[PDB]
Amino acid sequence: GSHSMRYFYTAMSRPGRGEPRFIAVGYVDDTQFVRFDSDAASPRMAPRAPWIEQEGPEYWDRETQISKTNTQTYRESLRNLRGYYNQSEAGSHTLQRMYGCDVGPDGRLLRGHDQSAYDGKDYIALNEDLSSWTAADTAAQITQRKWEAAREAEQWRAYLEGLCVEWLRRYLENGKETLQRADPPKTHVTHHPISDHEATLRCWALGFYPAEITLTWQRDGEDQTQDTELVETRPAGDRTFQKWAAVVVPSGEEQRYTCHVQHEGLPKPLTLRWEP
């Protein structure tokens, strides 16, 4: 019963196609609640979950001011980074940043996060002590020096221990009926014959929240990790998630195989066989 808030900043340049676009989205656990897009007609930080809508004008104005400013800062940053790698004016490049806090069941800060990537590659990350940086290369050492002089680490600690957890706690209470409700998955096993030799047993999990889940197949009580096929957990569009695990069994041996389902919304962990 622990929770997290994360913010995801994406800045993409597109030379010849206007100034770099800046996108920000806010998540509580696996629930998006705000977005900002500098490409929109009227750029504003916008609600994306009902429980944030009740917030008032000073809220939305602060979140829009900071995001509009970041739109400019992140453009300066994309330019600086192009410099640090001696990159041409012509290529497209991506700066990404994700940050936020983790709190336990009592609301106490478990740890903070701030990580940056450039063109998909780890660039700079705030260390778990919330007061020092890990730079991935000599380009990021420059950013480290700038942030050292700007005392950014202090600012992150104050935010990560302060507003982040306080507002997370405020969000968790205002959306308690969804953010603090775990919906267990609905499950079933299917059977798709392949040849006369073998068939596929597919274990399904549907409608669960949050997305964290464990689907495993056993043959005679022994886990089958090399032999199991897992889809990536996928969103259903209605806040819930879907997943499935498949295993190819010798035909006739289907009952030596069990599927086990671990999920927070489940009273007790599930064991399912194929029921023909």
Partner: peptide
């Protein structure tokens, strides 16, 4: 709630 804008990279 987002962090206050910070220094460029």
């Amino acid at each position: 709630t987002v962090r206050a804008s910070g220094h460029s990279y």
